[PDB]
XYZ file of C-alpha atoms in Angstrom:
706
model
C 63.191 1.521 74.534
C 63.303 -0.908 71.664
C 60.389 -4.096 72.149
C 60.236 -5.619 68.649
C 62.744 -6.799 66.362
C 62.980 -7.284 62.683
C 62.541 -10.848 61.122
C 62.930 -10.997 57.059
C 61.151 -13.358 55.176
C 62.086 -14.102 51.808
C 59.429 -16.360 50.478
C 62.085 -18.319 48.410
C 64.673 -18.192 50.682
C 64.754 -21.931 51.147
C 64.732 -22.780 47.787
C 67.573 -22.702 44.993
C 65.323 -21.477 42.010
C 64.842 -17.851 42.226
C 61.226 -17.952 40.643
C 58.363 -20.318 41.457
C 58.140 -23.189 39.163
C 54.760 -22.335 38.144
C 54.012 -18.892 36.814
C 51.405 -17.912 34.606
C 50.764 -14.795 32.212
C 47.615 -13.458 31.438
C 47.241 -10.583 29.040
C 44.561 -7.985 28.050
C 43.428 -6.568 24.776
C 56.708 -5.619 41.572
C 58.348 -2.154 42.790
C 55.692 0.026 43.551
C 52.924 -1.000 45.648
C 52.160 -4.270 47.333
C 50.064 -5.447 50.167
C 48.318 -8.571 51.582
C 44.816 -9.341 51.128
C 43.340 -12.030 53.181
C 40.867 -14.527 51.788
C 37.735 -16.585 52.836
C 39.927 -19.907 53.018
C 42.193 -18.245 55.647
C 44.958 -17.744 52.673
C 46.463 -14.475 52.297
C 47.476 -13.412 48.741
C 49.934 -10.702 47.914
C 49.861 -8.294 44.955
C 52.155 -6.150 43.393
C 51.514 -3.196 40.673
C 54.443 -3.371 38.264
C 56.322 -0.076 38.871
C 54.890 1.371 35.620
C 51.664 0.173 36.574
C 52.055 -1.938 33.718
C 51.657 -5.317 35.167
C 50.102 -6.666 38.334
C 51.583 -9.640 39.994
C 49.474 -11.993 42.380
C 50.789 -15.019 44.689
C 50.007 -16.761 48.127
C 51.938 -15.801 51.263
C 51.535 -19.322 53.014
C 53.314 -20.865 50.153
C 55.436 -18.551 47.405
C 57.591 -21.214 45.670
C 55.261 -24.400 44.899
C 52.200 -22.200 44.968
C 51.507 -20.169 41.644
C 51.586 -16.619 40.867
C 50.145 -14.731 38.008
C 51.446 -12.152 36.145
C 48.138 -10.207 34.985
C 49.528 -7.871 31.997
C 47.607 -4.898 31.446
C 46.874 -2.889 28.001
C 48.014 0.421 29.659
C 49.038 2.266 32.672
C 46.157 3.330 35.251
C 45.640 6.848 35.684
C 47.102 7.641 39.185
C 49.042 4.748 40.008
C 47.942 2.021 42.718
C 45.293 4.743 43.677
C 43.158 4.172 40.406
C 42.873 0.625 41.415
C 41.185 -1.275 44.072
C 41.094 -5.135 44.986
C 38.078 -6.857 46.970
C 37.090 -10.410 47.211
C 33.345 -10.266 45.935
C 32.228 -14.029 46.426
C 34.847 -16.791 45.922
C 36.183 -14.197 43.453
C 38.767 -11.364 43.032
C 37.406 -8.125 41.676
C 39.933 -5.740 40.565
C 38.964 -2.374 38.844
C 41.683 0.230 37.296
C 40.869 3.098 35.453
C 43.351 2.825 32.714
C 45.023 6.190 31.441
C 42.672 6.221 28.304
C 39.838 6.282 30.710
C 38.676 2.977 30.218
C 37.229 1.031 33.295
C 39.069 -2.380 33.550
C 37.416 -4.857 35.555
C 39.138 -8.189 36.215
C 37.369 -11.481 37.474
C 39.476 -14.141 39.053
C 38.025 -17.328 40.616
C 39.257 -18.198 43.899
C 40.111 -21.618 42.965
C 42.364 -20.278 39.886
C 44.648 -18.857 42.400
C 45.188 -21.971 44.270
C 44.785 -24.442 41.602
C 46.801 -25.793 38.639
C 45.599 -24.256 35.568
C 48.083 -22.913 33.390
C 45.193 -21.112 31.782
C 42.168 -19.003 32.268
C 39.250 -19.052 29.822
C 35.797 -17.490 29.443
C 35.231 -13.787 30.476
C 37.264 -12.598 33.473
C 38.360 -9.250 31.870
C 36.692 -6.511 29.839
C 36.853 -2.879 29.221
C 34.503 -0.013 29.276
C 34.116 3.826 29.508
C 31.067 4.901 31.662
C 32.505 8.789 31.601
C 34.737 10.975 29.619
C 37.703 11.238 31.970
C 39.204 13.155 28.983
C 37.957 16.507 30.730
C 37.925 15.841 34.419
C 40.246 13.114 34.910
C 40.209 11.259 38.193
C 43.128 9.802 40.404
C 41.658 8.231 43.311
C 39.373 5.211 42.553
C 37.626 3.769 45.648
C 35.617 0.969 46.952
C 32.219 1.201 48.666
C 29.913 -1.855 48.119
C 30.326 -4.775 45.310
C 27.765 -2.705 42.965
C 28.887 0.681 44.047
C 32.242 2.697 44.545
C 33.288 6.419 44.144
C 35.582 7.991 41.900
C 37.595 11.297 42.705
C 38.809 13.968 40.109
C 41.402 16.139 40.395
C 39.349 19.104 40.748
C 38.087 18.288 44.182
C 35.454 16.450 42.419
C 33.844 12.886 42.669
C 31.816 10.863 40.249
C 30.011 7.633 41.241
C 29.766 4.057 39.818
C 26.545 1.835 40.166
C 26.635 -1.836 39.031
C 23.064 -2.829 37.844
C 23.905 -6.313 36.191
C 27.015 -8.067 36.471
C 29.324 -5.989 34.551
C 27.964 -2.404 34.034
C 28.777 0.967 35.633
C 26.961 4.492 35.130
C 27.977 7.714 36.739
C 25.915 9.330 39.594
C 27.144 12.875 40.621
C 26.115 14.308 44.130
C 26.197 17.951 45.106
C 29.665 19.431 44.541
C 28.608 21.131 41.131
C 27.469 23.896 43.048
C 30.872 24.467 44.682
C 32.629 23.776 41.068
C 30.569 25.980 39.057
C 30.781 29.313 41.345
C 34.257 29.377 42.313
C 34.425 30.458 38.574
C 32.518 33.475 39.351
C 34.563 34.357 42.059
C 38.091 35.699 41.518
C 39.545 33.166 39.296
C 40.388 29.229 39.116
C 43.422 28.388 37.472
C 45.503 25.190 36.752
C 46.147 24.599 40.455
C 44.656 27.805 42.553
C 41.997 26.354 44.992
C 42.643 22.591 44.415
C 41.576 20.948 47.603
C 41.855 17.816 45.781
C 41.274 14.486 47.878
C 44.204 12.446 49.189
C 42.530 9.983 51.694
C 39.425 8.448 52.376
C 37.560 5.594 54.209
C 33.845 4.604 55.144
C 31.834 4.802 58.516
C 28.907 2.505 58.681
C 28.192 1.698 54.797
C 27.521 5.468 54.216
C 29.810 8.191 55.666
C 32.800 8.689 53.196
C 34.489 10.412 55.884
C 37.234 12.197 53.363
C 40.148 14.811 53.398
C 41.417 17.476 51.310
C 44.923 18.632 50.181
C 44.245 21.459 52.469
C 43.485 19.142 55.377
C 40.033 20.255 54.873
C 38.101 17.121 56.294
C 34.640 16.642 54.625
C 31.861 13.831 55.431
C 29.472 13.221 52.632
C 26.371 10.929 52.691
C 25.697 8.152 50.502
C 22.134 8.389 51.486
C 21.806 12.057 50.207
C 24.632 12.652 47.499
C 25.157 15.997 49.449
C 28.295 16.798 51.580
C 27.168 16.638 54.953
C 30.110 18.742 56.472
C 33.528 20.262 55.549
C 35.575 20.812 58.864
C 38.873 22.737 58.096
C 41.411 20.586 60.006
C 44.081 23.472 59.967
C 42.509 25.633 62.985
C 41.963 23.301 65.415
C 45.321 24.291 67.256
C 47.810 27.197 66.598
C 47.365 27.286 62.843
C 51.055 27.516 61.924
C 50.872 30.262 59.397
C 54.342 30.736 57.620
C 54.119 27.186 55.782
C 51.627 24.520 56.100
C 52.751 21.771 53.462
C 49.523 21.180 51.528
C 48.880 17.706 50.522
C 51.175 17.120 47.062
C 51.261 13.572 46.463
C 48.218 11.453 47.123
C 48.618 8.985 50.287
C 47.507 6.932 53.185
C 46.785 9.999 55.509
C 44.220 8.716 57.780
C 42.890 5.355 59.022
C 39.447 4.650 61.236
C 39.051 2.016 63.818
C 35.984 1.752 65.798
C 34.065 5.052 66.671
C 37.484 6.663 66.372
C 39.476 8.317 63.651
C 43.299 9.370 63.354
C 44.915 11.743 60.809
C 48.456 12.859 59.987
C 48.830 16.618 59.730
C 51.857 18.565 58.226
C 53.586 20.027 61.336
C 57.516 19.452 60.921
C 55.974 16.061 60.606
C 54.185 15.499 64.049
C 50.555 15.837 63.869
C 48.266 12.960 64.510
C 44.917 14.517 65.083
C 42.490 12.013 66.423
C 38.986 13.485 66.771
C 36.769 10.411 67.406
C 33.417 10.306 65.458
C 29.869 10.731 66.753
C 27.334 10.460 64.221
C 23.815 9.991 65.126
C 21.506 12.389 66.696
C 18.882 14.584 64.724
C 21.774 16.242 63.197
C 23.059 13.442 60.927
C 26.826 14.167 61.205
C 29.790 15.155 63.729
C 33.511 15.046 64.074
C 34.421 15.553 67.441
C 37.967 16.831 67.685
C 40.018 15.923 70.646
C 43.724 15.596 70.697
C 46.776 16.235 68.450
C 49.503 13.994 69.644
C 53.033 14.664 67.928
C 55.597 12.129 66.621
C 59.155 12.073 67.897
C 60.451 11.904 64.469
C 63.823 13.720 65.051
C 66.594 13.605 62.517
C 65.295 16.619 60.720
C 61.630 14.863 60.379
C 62.059 13.718 56.681
C 59.951 10.490 57.193
C 56.815 10.360 55.215
C 54.412 7.985 56.122
C 54.087 4.721 54.404
C 51.117 3.381 55.739
C 49.615 2.854 59.288
C 46.785 1.297 60.886
C 44.588 2.164 63.859
C 43.895 -0.689 66.069
C 43.194 -2.912 69.221
C 45.483 -3.320 72.204
C 48.375 -5.702 71.716
C 50.524 -6.677 74.680
C 53.725 -4.840 75.707
C 55.246 -3.163 78.487
C 52.957 -1.037 80.293
C 49.440 -2.178 81.257
C 47.703 1.181 80.607
C 46.305 0.168 77.265
C 43.051 0.875 75.227
C 44.463 1.607 71.361
C 47.547 1.162 69.242
C 48.395 3.235 66.156
C 51.137 1.253 64.036
C 52.803 3.684 62.259
C 55.282 3.142 59.546
C 57.740 5.335 58.062
C 60.028 5.765 55.436
C 63.215 7.401 54.254
C 64.919 6.666 51.220
C 64.873 2.954 51.293
C 65.184 2.907 55.200
C 62.091 2.749 57.355
C 60.937 2.843 60.814
C 57.931 1.299 62.595
C 56.228 2.385 65.784
C 53.664 1.357 67.764
C 51.910 4.405 69.656
C 50.303 3.095 72.762
C 47.245 4.967 74.133
C 46.876 4.531 78.109
C 43.358 5.865 78.493
C 40.656 6.811 76.579
C 41.469 10.273 77.425
C 43.501 11.409 74.656
C 46.537 12.904 76.184
C 48.238 9.988 78.389
C 50.163 8.198 75.764
C 53.209 6.269 75.492
C 55.403 5.945 72.258
C 57.172 2.302 71.378
C 60.021 1.784 68.971
C 61.537 -1.425 67.327
C 64.910 -2.435 65.648
C 65.147 -1.387 62.259
C 67.489 -4.186 61.166
C 67.180 -7.722 61.160
C 69.777 -9.229 63.633
C 71.361 -10.829 60.751
C 71.710 -7.284 58.851
C 73.294 -6.224 62.037
C 75.515 -8.869 62.537
C 77.396 -8.372 58.935
C 77.277 -4.365 59.343
C 79.178 -4.277 62.564
C 81.287 -7.263 61.834
C 79.790 -9.233 65.008
C 79.467 -12.836 63.480
C 81.660 -15.282 65.197
C 80.361 -18.625 63.980
C 80.274 -18.414 60.218
C 83.071 -20.267 58.666
C 86.023 -18.099 57.475
C 88.743 -18.957 55.333
C 88.989 -19.679 51.407
C 86.885 -17.251 49.197
C 85.012 -19.885 47.445
C 83.881 -20.522 50.660
C 83.041 -16.965 51.597
C 81.316 -17.261 48.341
C 79.267 -20.118 49.285
C 78.298 -18.140 52.535
C 77.116 -14.925 51.032
C 75.015 -17.460 48.926
C 73.275 -18.967 51.677
C 72.911 -15.814 53.937
C 71.332 -13.907 51.006
C 69.982 -16.915 49.025
C 69.116 -17.156 45.344
C 66.858 -14.265 44.451
C 68.846 -11.535 46.230
C 72.202 -13.308 45.408
C 71.406 -13.498 41.347
C 70.296 -10.233 41.300
C 73.599 -8.922 42.434
C 75.473 -11.182 40.245
C 74.120 -9.670 37.018
C 74.233 -6.302 38.461
C 78.233 -7.026 38.975
C 78.414 -8.298 35.045
C 76.034 -5.659 33.919
C 78.699 -3.136 35.425
C 81.466 -4.874 33.903
C 82.832 -6.664 36.650
C 83.952 -10.245 36.760
C 85.885 -12.825 38.624
C 89.748 -12.892 38.148
C 91.354 -16.224 39.782
C 89.202 -18.244 41.846
C 90.447 -15.891 44.720
C 89.615 -12.580 43.508
C 89.176 -11.211 46.936
C 88.157 -8.074 45.155
C 85.194 -9.739 43.416
C 84.167 -10.224 47.270
C 84.001 -7.006 48.840
C 82.165 -6.117 45.711
C 79.416 -8.941 45.761
C 79.243 -7.935 49.272
C 78.408 -4.608 49.050
C 75.974 -5.336 46.442
C 74.191 -7.580 48.555
C 73.704 -5.399 51.702
C 72.460 -3.115 48.800
C 70.237 -5.396 46.726
C 68.441 -6.561 50.012
C 67.834 -3.117 51.250
C 66.511 -2.182 47.898
C 64.310 -5.216 48.175
C 63.069 -4.780 51.520
C 61.748 -1.340 51.088
C 58.526 -0.594 53.119
C 55.309 -0.100 51.440
C 52.259 -1.215 53.454
C 51.485 -2.756 56.914
C 49.227 -5.952 57.476
C 48.054 -8.062 60.342
C 48.730 -11.330 59.784
C 46.107 -13.093 61.932
C 45.051 -11.031 64.799
C 47.580 -8.480 65.815
C 50.873 -9.507 63.919
C 53.065 -6.828 62.435
C 54.118 -7.695 58.661
C 55.411 -5.249 56.604
C 55.419 -5.560 52.544
C 58.102 -4.948 50.457
C 58.547 -3.632 47.018
C 60.239 -6.521 45.422
C 57.807 -9.582 45.793
C 58.392 -12.819 48.054
C 59.802 -10.231 50.503
C 58.230 -9.346 53.692
C 59.322 -8.240 57.200
C 57.731 -9.508 60.409
C 58.316 -7.042 63.466
C 58.328 -9.670 66.520
C 57.784 -8.723 70.221
C 61.231 -9.375 71.778
C 61.237 -11.662 74.923
C 63.169 -10.788 77.973
C 66.152 -11.566 77.089
C 65.953 -10.084 73.496
C 65.466 -6.925 75.103
C 68.709 -6.621 77.256
C 70.290 -7.836 74.035
C 68.739 -4.974 71.663
C 68.809 -2.548 74.643
C 72.238 -3.033 76.439
C 73.863 0.382 75.822
C 70.091 1.717 75.153
C 69.585 1.854 78.949
C 70.125 1.673 82.630
C 68.309 -0.092 85.651
C 66.393 -3.229 85.144
C 66.892 -6.484 87.362
C 70.430 -7.367 88.415
C 70.707 -10.018 85.782
C 70.545 -7.461 82.880
C 73.557 -5.433 84.550
C 75.835 -8.626 85.002
C 75.176 -9.147 81.474
C 76.087 -5.995 80.541
C 79.446 -5.580 82.952
C 80.260 -9.081 81.086
C 79.502 -7.265 77.634
C 81.298 -4.303 78.549
C 84.613 -6.471 78.701
C 84.096 -9.089 75.804
C 83.272 -6.187 73.366
C 87.171 -5.366 73.789
C 88.441 -8.375 72.509
C 88.697 -9.256 69.041
C 86.885 -11.771 67.069
C 89.609 -13.884 66.248
C 89.873 -13.916 70.049
C 86.240 -14.807 70.608
C 86.058 -17.575 67.963
C 89.576 -18.850 69.381
C 87.847 -19.562 72.532
C 84.398 -20.366 71.546
C 86.271 -22.862 69.707
C 88.240 -24.066 72.835
C 84.992 -24.383 74.871
C 83.823 -26.834 71.864
C 86.463 -29.182 72.642
C 86.131 -29.523 76.544
C 82.910 -31.472 75.386
C 83.943 -33.223 72.078
C 86.837 -34.432 73.987
C 89.462 -32.768 71.881
C 90.768 -31.207 75.197
C 91.220 -34.424 77.064
C 88.805 -35.440 79.549
C 91.524 -36.459 82.311
C 92.317 -32.825 83.114
C 90.637 -30.888 85.742
C 87.746 -28.447 84.626
C 90.529 -26.208 86.199
C 93.487 -27.007 84.126
C 91.742 -26.532 80.844
C 90.353 -23.283 81.831
C 94.149 -22.210 82.096
C 95.541 -23.669 78.806
C 92.254 -21.737 77.493
C 94.116 -18.715 79.147
C 97.652 -19.053 77.657
C 96.197 -20.153 74.382
C 93.545 -17.647 73.910
C 93.450 -14.642 76.534
C 97.146 -13.946 77.668
C 98.405 -10.610 76.306
C 95.067 -10.448 74.242
C 93.356 -7.722 76.137
C 94.002 -4.567 77.982
C 94.742 -5.254 81.534
C 92.985 -1.960 82.423
C 89.459 -3.312 81.521
C 90.384 -6.759 83.413
C 89.788 -4.349 86.951
C 86.912 -2.970 85.973
C 85.154 -6.197 85.244
C 86.548 -7.649 88.383
C 85.463 -5.326 90.771
C 82.137 -4.145 88.807
C 81.617 -7.862 88.934
C 82.026 -7.988 92.558
C 79.088 -6.216 93.625
C 76.924 -9.020 92.001
C 75.296 -11.944 93.721
C 76.765 -13.971 91.024
C 75.863 -17.461 92.198
C 72.304 -16.152 92.098
C 71.974 -13.933 88.960
C 73.777 -16.777 87.363
C 71.045 -19.246 88.711
C 68.261 -16.944 87.288
C 70.033 -16.444 84.039
C 70.561 -20.222 83.511
C 67.438 -21.600 84.807
C 64.512 -19.033 84.191
C 66.058 -17.122 81.327
C 67.707 -19.727 79.077
C 66.603 -23.245 79.996
C 63.042 -23.381 79.587
C 60.979 -25.370 82.110
C 58.203 -27.437 80.519
C 55.666 -26.824 78.124
C 52.374 -28.714 78.917
C 51.547 -27.997 75.397
C 49.785 -24.697 75.053
C 48.196 -25.501 71.619
C 49.901 -24.129 68.469
C 47.438 -25.429 66.113
C 48.728 -28.319 64.167
C 49.135 -27.149 60.811
C 47.441 -29.292 58.330
C 48.932 -28.145 54.663
C 52.630 -26.865 54.477
C 52.825 -23.223 55.441
C 56.084 -21.990 54.174
C 55.603 -18.498 55.772
C 55.300 -19.488 59.275
C 57.848 -21.756 58.522
C 60.894 -19.587 58.296
C 59.305 -16.957 60.700
C 60.082 -19.762 63.054
C 63.523 -20.476 61.988
C 64.679 -16.933 61.696
C 63.218 -16.162 65.221
C 64.638 -19.403 66.393
C 68.090 -18.015 65.295
C 67.832 -14.806 66.413
C 67.093 -16.189 69.823
C 69.891 -18.739 70.244
C 72.400 -16.377 68.720
C 71.544 -13.991 71.818
C 72.094 -17.067 73.917
C 75.113 -17.999 72.351
C 76.634 -14.571 72.965
C 75.586 -14.778 76.801
C 76.564 -18.161 76.985
C 79.883 -17.418 75.616
C 80.575 -14.297 77.794
C 79.848 -15.860 81.073
C 82.133 -18.805 80.481
C 84.806 -16.382 79.393
C 84.766 -15.294 83.243
C 85.348 -18.611 84.365
C 88.694 -18.741 82.551
C 89.822 -15.069 83.748
C 89.260 -15.534 87.475
C 89.820 -18.263 89.857
C 86.443 -19.012 91.145
C 85.604 -22.523 92.681
C 85.169 -24.969 90.040
C 83.243 -26.952 92.546
C 80.754 -24.474 93.537
C 79.585 -23.045 90.470
C 80.841 -26.174 88.866
C 77.447 -27.462 88.467
C 76.432 -24.774 85.975
C 79.875 -24.681 83.864
C 79.075 -28.393 82.680
C 75.620 -27.247 81.976
C 76.907 -24.083 80.393
C 79.370 -25.820 77.992
C 76.640 -28.249 77.046
C 74.700 -25.279 75.979
C 77.344 -23.284 74.442
C 78.248 -26.408 72.405
C 74.653 -27.168 71.528
C 73.762 -23.740 70.327
C 76.834 -23.417 68.165
C 75.802 -26.342 66.624
C 72.414 -25.260 65.626
C 74.138 -22.021 64.475
C 76.581 -23.661 62.145
C 73.686 -25.778 60.847
C 71.490 -22.767 60.423
C 74.184 -21.611 57.693
C 74.890 -25.049 56.286
C 71.488 -25.562 55.172
C 68.428 -23.508 56.071
C 65.404 -25.450 54.259
C 67.124 -28.647 55.839
C 67.419 -27.278 59.362
C 63.774 -26.132 58.918
C 62.345 -29.741 58.024
C 64.272 -31.448 60.725
C 62.804 -28.880 63.089
C 59.156 -28.501 61.734
C 58.821 -32.561 61.888
C 60.469 -33.201 64.977
C 57.188 -31.750 66.392
C 55.724 -34.736 64.765
C 52.266 -33.817 65.076
C 52.941 -30.700 63.615
C 54.868 -32.260 60.846
C 53.893 -29.280 58.528
C 54.071 -26.514 60.947
C 52.044 -24.011 63.169
C 49.939 -21.436 62.419
C 50.306 -18.766 64.903
C 47.930 -15.791 65.269
C 49.249 -13.569 68.410
C 52.644 -13.005 69.661
C 51.878 -15.178 72.659
C 51.339 -17.825 70.068
C 54.663 -16.942 68.437
C 57.056 -16.945 71.312
C 55.456 -19.899 72.992
C 56.433 -22.062 69.711
C 59.791 -20.556 69.338
C 60.893 -21.371 72.714
C 59.260 -24.847 72.437
C 62.105 -25.303 69.780
C 64.473 -23.528 71.846
C 63.919 -26.452 73.636
C 64.162 -29.473 71.377
C 67.550 -28.152 70.825
C 68.545 -27.880 74.363
C 67.183 -30.955 75.542
C 68.319 -33.067 72.518
C 71.213 -35.607 72.736
C 74.665 -34.877 71.728
C 76.139 -38.091 71.941
C 77.675 -40.109 69.020
C 76.387 -43.579 69.297
C 78.581 -44.765 66.772
C 81.191 -43.391 64.327
C 78.969 -42.442 61.476
C 77.800 -39.958 63.928
C 81.430 -38.680 65.374
C 82.408 -37.931 61.674
C 79.240 -36.145 60.825
C 79.861 -34.059 63.983
C 83.797 -33.488 63.348
C 82.832 -32.558 59.938
C 79.855 -29.840 59.787
C 80.837 -28.456 63.309
């Protein structure tokens, strides 16, 4: 039931200086919202709005470290946060608009080149204030964007102004028709500080005119930018059992609806489970029409305390089922923690739908939590210290080392085992803090990227390959081909041994190949050595019967032939274009290595459990013998890659993104098909690479690192 995993991308992950070398600070006179805006030159740029709407940082996704980042300081906080702010690339320039508190209208103009150039300075006129209206009376809160010259505003009193650009930098108010509905709610019984405040909290734009909106009280309106008159005003709350008692009226502004083609989709307050999707149908003599259709509910259990974070209506993807048409990628939050789901719509008919979910934690994050890492070098403390620094990397590691001093805690001797457990917990923490959701983004066609609060941090949700589903869905399911079951009855045993025990074995297996466990011996004696030494009196005999019997009802010879030759060991890639990347893309770079790692990790576990049976049961070392010698080869290879993963990530990446010579800069994926493709390609280079020391310089290098 889980189809995508979470791959975490810390743009500075590889590097050791927590901050880009080239950082520029412009003035005038993050930890709030962050998102990616694609550009002309096929370059995504990310933005952050300092918590206090004070600062607005900028940087290039594809190259966080060497690339340059800008910290555009501001005269003073905008009106209603990231709402009274919009960013669109006019023409070879970025146009930022920010109705500061004072009611000014700040407009920035940044050259495209000034982002991807070298300049530590920007001169001329890029920023300029203004005051085309007295926002002293009717304060706004939802600055929008329509055209390069026009874009509407929105006041807290269900009102809306307008801004028309005549020249190059000038705007003048253009009211519509509301005034009527405003002046008269005065003559009717009352109009307090917040009585009938159907203020707007969402909006869009269908066919350059229709500002399909929405109000606090779900009243959906549809103005006309060729009339300046509100063409309609639906009452969303009355298109299905209008839950009396308590309808949570939109309090805090937010992304409550998105529109794709003809369709629209809307989140509605019903124990958090209302996605009303009434497709549009606008032309006819009648100029407007919102055709309600269905109202799908969300499976947000655990009390339903999951506020939306952003979401997106869009094309089909490529998942399990065939029945496809649309995908509503939805992203919720809860404290720092978050959930991302893809809501598959089987047919145009809005009633046959199927929900898909994904793992909310990186495989790495998961390993540490449930203490499941068997590869990481243990022992010392300055060692466990080195590790953490790697698994977490500079930025997060330094933030946590500050916080440990700020909170008056320091290291006793160079074995302060308590500093550790501390550093450790702060790290789990600083990381989850940093990884807080904030907005989706479709890198390329349909690739899900989540932007997080703390800059240089993103999270890609990848579509699981076959094995990856079994891994991530072992306990999570029943049924599925034979292999799955086999892999589970194996897991259903290994799980019960201790790690010290697993390590100890994997250890031995490594030897059968390095030779430490002398060749002479029969691949039948070692397996017994590796039994008195590693598994005798190390497991409950009871579970041993389960495995044996359970293991029987399996065509082992087969399931195992499918596992090793159709699941793990790939065949041959007749090179299905990955798009040789010209300039070094650091983003795509780590999305690869992390994803590479996630796979081998799962292979490694599987590989390991399989072999474990070849020692715990007398099976014909001459029948399956073909496999074993292959299994060991794999096991030994996987492990080596894993250990290497930890030793030095940046390095492991260069030798894996230049090994693919023509692509000695990386690849440029645009769809999950291209992604898996690539991954497996490397999955290969690893599995098909020589592991024989052609000299001592090499035997050493191996004995050491491994």
